[PDB]
A and B are shown apart, each in its own frame.
Chain A
Amino acid sequence: NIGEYVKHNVTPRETVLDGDTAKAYLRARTYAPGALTPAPAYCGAVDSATKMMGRLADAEKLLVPRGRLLRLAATEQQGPTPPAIAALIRNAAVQTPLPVYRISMVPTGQAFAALAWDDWARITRDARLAEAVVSAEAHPDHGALGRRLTDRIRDAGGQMYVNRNEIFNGALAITNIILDLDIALKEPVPFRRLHEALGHFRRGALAAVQLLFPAARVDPDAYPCYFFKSACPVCSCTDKIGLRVCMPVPAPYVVHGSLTMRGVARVIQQAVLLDRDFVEAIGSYVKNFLLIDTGVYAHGHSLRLPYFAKICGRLLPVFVIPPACKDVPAFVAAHADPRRFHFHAPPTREIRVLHSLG
């Protein structure tokens, strides 16, 4: 079973913070409450590798009272004055912690972008379904509605807008369970089969999520799991089929650690491989079975974000609508809020911090 695996092979450590220390922890170790709320234009620090090393060397010359992907990821604080990043970003109304991104550039080379806010509509308007189009799509069965909605859909400071990888910052907490599926497959796969296989991914993974987070009312019907499939509704995708599954951390919990989230991912992996439905629905297509790169949660490592290509599969949503969902317009709309697909986002009394699994 899975109870057995999370009875022997995982050792939870949680620390119930409480009262004001809870708010302090949330504000301190997650992105600021406006880092991921949309904005008319970006205030950030975007340049190539070399120009970023220079601009760091120039912000060091104004940060003399103490002390490139560790250092950008390091530059966080606030105090009651502007934060220390403001020497690099060059505004005074920046707020921290704030995202740091790795940007592949044509033809080669890497750029980084620490930004206090961005225009998330410019990124996700050519993927957003109008509230009316949803509300008129009229299609009762949730496999049916999810599949039809999926059918509908449609310079460094410019290259950030087609390739953008998010850098894990182990200083920060984790409020979302960002899984990185890399299903390799021998014969191609239709899309209704994949969509139902994902309906069976969510159910097993939510059972695993509920075992790992015991004091959480994670109803395996309405709990949101957000799926993004890389474009390659015909699948047309041979060799490899890249998914991305993002789940909110359940209510009172937050996760701390690279090893803690490596453990969470591996438990979800074994739980979905222990669901007999999933490996029927998806087997005989799938060569290997390692569906989850649990080593992507290491500090300094990057995951391509939804709505970004590769240097070109835009990770675009596959609405695996919850069984017994409640407000379908809102579930569709959340595939666009950046808070639902960054590691260290603000959570949406006490909290418990799962800082170890073993």
Chain B
Amino acid sequence: IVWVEESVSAITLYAVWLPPAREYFHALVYFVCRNAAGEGRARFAEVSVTATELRDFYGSQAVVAAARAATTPAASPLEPLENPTLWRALYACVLAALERQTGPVALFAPLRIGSDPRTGLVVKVERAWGPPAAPRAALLVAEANIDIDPMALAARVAEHPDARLAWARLAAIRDTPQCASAASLTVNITTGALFAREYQTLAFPGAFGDLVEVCEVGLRPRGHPQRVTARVLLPRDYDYFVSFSAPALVALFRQWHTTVHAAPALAPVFAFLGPEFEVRGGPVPYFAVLGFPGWPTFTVLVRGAAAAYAALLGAWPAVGARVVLPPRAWPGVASAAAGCLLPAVREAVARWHPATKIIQLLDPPAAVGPVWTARFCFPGLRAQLLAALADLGGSGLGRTGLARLDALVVAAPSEPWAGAVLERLVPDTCNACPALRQLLGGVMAAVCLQIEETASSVKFAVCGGDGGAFWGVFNVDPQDADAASGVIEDARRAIETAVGAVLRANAVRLRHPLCLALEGVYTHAVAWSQAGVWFWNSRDNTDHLGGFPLRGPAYTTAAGVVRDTLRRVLGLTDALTARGLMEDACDRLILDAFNKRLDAEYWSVRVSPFEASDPLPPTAFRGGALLDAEHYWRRVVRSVGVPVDLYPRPLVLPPVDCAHHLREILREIELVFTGVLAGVWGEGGKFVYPFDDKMSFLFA
């Protein structure tokens, strides 16, 4: 049972079979292990997963439906599209069985690796000491020309009216695998050697031996009554790729698979996941290798994806919220954490409803005159609270996922990659369990009632927010003088220490002690919606605007105009002169929009897969390899809608409907302006801009 001090680089699923049994299955995992010198080696481990653990990571399906995902070992190449959460489940459950049976496992980190020479399988893993092998990076540029018939690519969206077209593209490539066979492909894998490859048709004719090493290892898995040989591709001098045609990578790796696994031996899984694999897309890009090749492909800095990989064992974002804790083991932690809280806080956690008025705020629309406004925040308080409460409910379910969460929480303040992961994971685990919605609502309610209670005593008056982000007026300061930094400092310390004391008093223990940020000191503020607030500092003409949509470039120019307009408008300290300044700003905006009356990309808005939008022109269905970049947002101009990205460049368009787009923008600017006029000068008059009367003609 030999121990080698090494450093796993990737963990990837090789095979998934069921022994002479009925209610559980096994998996065989592939390890990319490297010595202190970098010298690569290839080891394996075996794991068992029960029906219940699978259902837990799925959120109930059946293990015969996760072993007929041993049709992935052929040329049926996009098997996850059939059932994506099944694969997210199977991979998260294997990564839990592996730590629960082989022990702690940490990508890129010094490790102690056992074995069983009778069998060759890794049996145990532990930590160790040594200055580990630096992950080397390989660059990858790849392009492919898949010939998908663009009438088949429209039938899919005929069935799925919101389908992102990277998904329709993949679904077609799934319904006729042979499209990836006759497909041009160019690849250029730089590895500090060089691997270019022409492929006029990818089924026909640097060295593929200086890029990978083909290794065959003999294994005797307990799940098999026979010795079975695993053939792998061990990277040399690189540990991951950095790159996006998802079908380009799919067909490339599918060629590699068909070639390597030609002769008699055992055949890997070949499964990939990405946002292109869901019908409605998914906001963030990633390409999850969880199968044949054996190592990742970070589709981008890059130290960010590398570190996220290493910290969450590579399952993020592939597996989703299953990184931290199974889906159907969240109700237990929710209830358990709920029980540990003080009964006042528990009544809060039980009567949380999303739309509640917990703190009295400035009722919109209203403005705050020359005061000392301050705008605070607790950086990432929802992630800290989720981690802390998951701990506090731990005894309702192991804790390795929660340790990953805790690493992401201690790392967020200093590294932004951790912050990104948190901002994407906290929402999505709540989406997987609503009792988490309510627990977080309750504890945030308690954290708002304090802050209110403390602000009563620290010359602060909460004027708006949510409890991790809030702002208010120091209605004791002299509207002047340098004795304003001192009071804001005292207030920030008092609220930091009070919120910390409250969270302790409920047995919620925070990874790293709260810091109350001061995100700016202002002197005027106007509030026009729930989310809409503009701030301004008269001492130094600095501002902040929040609540305006930024749906395209037109909207960022508009937001700049609204900010400059509000600066002048609050420089007037009647209402009519304000309206003059506002209509002057809108006039100048429409004229400068006329100068950009041809720039289609500027007037394009981004439309989610949920907000109903313009239908697709059939001409967009044959945009070729640009549909494959459409995973979340569709960028549309308009009257008939144009998806400006499903067409080659440069566009050849009728005039862009600048009146439609300026009408939208003017409606939002008019919300802002009605708010400011009502709030500061008490006008009941909704601000309206005459567009159809003046300036309509410019776009007729």
Contacts and interface: CB of A to CB of B under 8 A. Distances in A.
Interface stretch (A19-27, A108-116, A207-215): A19-27
Nearest to A63: B652
B693 interface: yes
Contacts of A77: 598, 652-655
A25 to B, nearest CB: 7
B134 interface: no
A84 interface: yes
Given A21-B594, A21-B595, A353 B697 contact: yes
B interface secondary structure, majority: loop
B651 to A, nearest CB: 5
A25 B647 contact: no
Nearest to B646: A65
Contacts of A170: 700
Contacts of B648: 65
B60 interface: no
A13 B652 contact: no
Given A17-B591, A24-B594, A66-B642, A256 B697 contact: yes
Interface string B624-668: 000000000000000010100001101111110000000000000
B697 A257 contact: yes
B693 A13 contact: yes
Given A13-B694, A25-B698, A64 B619 contact: yes
Interface string A66-110: 110000001001110100100000000000000000000000000
A248 to B, nearest CB: 21
Interface string A161-193: 000000000110000000000000000000000
B700 A256 contact: yes
A355 B693 CA distance: 9
A63 B647 CA distance: 11
A15 interface: yes
A24 to B, nearest CB: 6
B619 A65 contact: yes
B595 A24 contact: yes
Nearest to A15: B694
A64 B647 contact: yes
B642 A65 contact: yes
Given A21-B594, A65-B642, A81 B697 contact: no
A252 to B, nearest CB: 16
Using C-beta atoms within 8 Å of the partner chain, give the interface range for chain B: 20 to 34
A74 B700 contact: no
Given A24-B595, A79-B598, A67 B654 contact: yes
Using C-beta atoms within 8 Å of the partner chain, give the interface range for chain A: 20 to 34
B260 interface: no
A170 B699 CA distance: 11
A13 B617 CA distance: 38
A21 B589 CA distance: 12
B329 interface: no
Given A21-B594, A21-B595, A24-B595, A65 B697 contact: no
B695 A15 contact: yes
Nearest to A84: B652
Given A65-B653, A84-B652, A355-B697, A21 B591 contact: yes
Contacts of A66: 617, 640, 642, 651-654
Residue among B591, B598, B640 facing the most chain A CB atoms (10 A cut-off)? B591
B652 A65 contact: yes
Nearest to B641: A66
A28 B650 CA distance: 20
A266 B650 CA distance: 45
A229 to B, nearest CB: 34
A175 B696 CA distance: 19
Contacts of A24: 594-595
Interface in A296-311: none
Nearest to A21: B591
A66 B594 CA distance: 21
B597 to A, nearest CB: 8
A25 B594 contact: yes
Interface in B675-695: 693-695
Contacts of A65: 619, 642, 647-648, 651-653
B658 to A, nearest CB: 12
Contacts of A81: 650
Given A63-B652, A65-B642, A20 B697 contact: no
Contacts of B655: 77
Contacts of B617: 66
Nearest to A82: B652
Given A28-B597, A65-B642, 16 more contacts: A13-B693, A13-B694, A17-B591, A21-B591, A24-B595, A25-B594, A64-B647, A65-B647, A66-B642, A66-B651, A67-B640, A67-B654, A77-B655, A79-B650, A84-B652, A171-B700
Interface of A: 13, 15, 17, 20-21, 24-25, 28, 63-67, 74, 77-79, 81, 84, 170-171, 256-257, 353, 355-356
